[PDB]
Design a protein around this ligand. Structure first.
Ligand SMILES: Nc1ncnc2c1ncn2[C@@H]1O[C@H](C[C@@H](N)CC[C@H](N)C(=O)O)[C@@H](O)[C@H]1O
Length: 327
């Protein structure tokens, strides 16, 4: 169902495809700009539904493996210009060994991975890494093919990395933070647990990818940008805009988790944003009246952006309200 290399209309690290053009449906244009992200792998009918709900736009499928050392396959529905995109610099390390230098010295020659799988919320238990330890410990390299297959399967499944001889480990949160393009300690401290760190990171945007798409906005909004960020999580979008050097004037962030909200608030302060950050807890508390007053108070929204959430319906309802209001 998906393209041969998932580079969308193009990725910075490879040659542009032969086709980099898109003609936006007439209704799909106009302010505001919108950016919707969903899992790439999904039945035909779902993406059909999403497209029909979002002004007939066809999704742009891209794998974040072209932006970092971990794969992430996503479909992005948007109405942004597609040309003159530039990446965040410097480019993220794109192999496990580049990203995690301490992992290279203990990487067995028989482990061919140079790229991690999609980063998820759950982590490999001590029990499993123990099983792997005992499975490889008996041999002083290399282990029988069937055990090689057993441990390679477990490692791929759980994104385990080598940290010593006979020792694999799940990624620690700082490693995940950097793989996703977040500043270090972005999710550390302040009342969030470790497992919740993994859950908030596992559900986030890959920042380099998103920034590559949003980079076209930098010239358009020198006054600063007003953003409706829906299901904003730990603020992947805001961090992308920030790393792009796009000033943020007003951000309306709708996020159910208090832990996520606090993470984003801390970040907002730490980066000394002069602009305004406004939090709402439920996407269902943004009615036409609330949107109206937000807009008459702060000006219209330049970008509305949301990620992988009836909640999609909430996104659509809200985007439609905003576009209606703005004309
Ligand atoms: N009803 C809701 N209203 C607003 N946010 C929700 C709601 N339900 C779940 N969420 C938040 O949805 C975010 C949707 C995630 N895919 C977001 C990841 C986020 N975009 C990031 O880049 O970090 C999470 O914070 C979900 O917990």
């Amino acid at each position: 169902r998906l393209p041969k290399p998932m580079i969308g209309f193009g990725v910075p690290t490879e040659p542009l495809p032969a086709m980099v053009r898109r003609t936006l449906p007439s209704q799909a244009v106009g302010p505001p700009f919108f950016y919707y992200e969903n899992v790439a792998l999904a039945p035909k009918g779902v993406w059909d539904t999403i497209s029909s709900s979002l002004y007939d736009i066809e999704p742009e499928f891209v794998d974040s493996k072209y932006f970092c050392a971990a794969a992430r396959k996503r479909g992005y529905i948007h109405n942004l210009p597609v040309e003159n995109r530039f990446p965040l610099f410097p480019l993220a390390p794109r192999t496990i060994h580049e990203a995690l230098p301490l992992s290279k010295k203990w990487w067995p020659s028989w482990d061919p991975r140079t790229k991690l799988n999609c980063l998820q919320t759950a982590i490999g238990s001590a029990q499993l890494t123990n099983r792997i330890r005992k499975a490889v410990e008996d041999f002083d390299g290399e282990p029988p093919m069937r055990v090689q297959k057993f441990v390679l399967d477990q490692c791929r499944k759980w994104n385990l990395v080598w940290v010593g001889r006979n020792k694999v480990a799940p990624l620690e949160p700082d490693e995940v933070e950097m793989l996703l393009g977040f500043p270090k300690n972005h999710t550390r401290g302040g009342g969030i647990s470790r497992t919740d760190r993994y859950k908030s990171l596992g559900n986030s945007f890959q920042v380099d990818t998103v920034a590559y798409h949003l980079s076209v906005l930098k010239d358009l909004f020198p006054g600063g940008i007003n953003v409706l960020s829906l299901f904003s999580g730990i603020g992947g979008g805001e961090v992308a805009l920030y790393r792009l050097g796009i000033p943020l004037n007003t951000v309306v962030s709708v996020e159910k988790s208090e832990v996520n909200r606090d993470i984003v608030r801390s970040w907002w302060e730490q980066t000394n944003q002069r602009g305004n950050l406004i939090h709402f807890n439920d996407v269902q508390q943004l009615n036409g009246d609330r949107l109206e007053q937000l807009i008459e108070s702060f000006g219209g929204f330049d970008l509305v952006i949301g990620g992988s959430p009836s909640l999609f319906s909430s996104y659509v309802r809200i985007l439609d309200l905003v576009k209606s209001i703005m004309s």
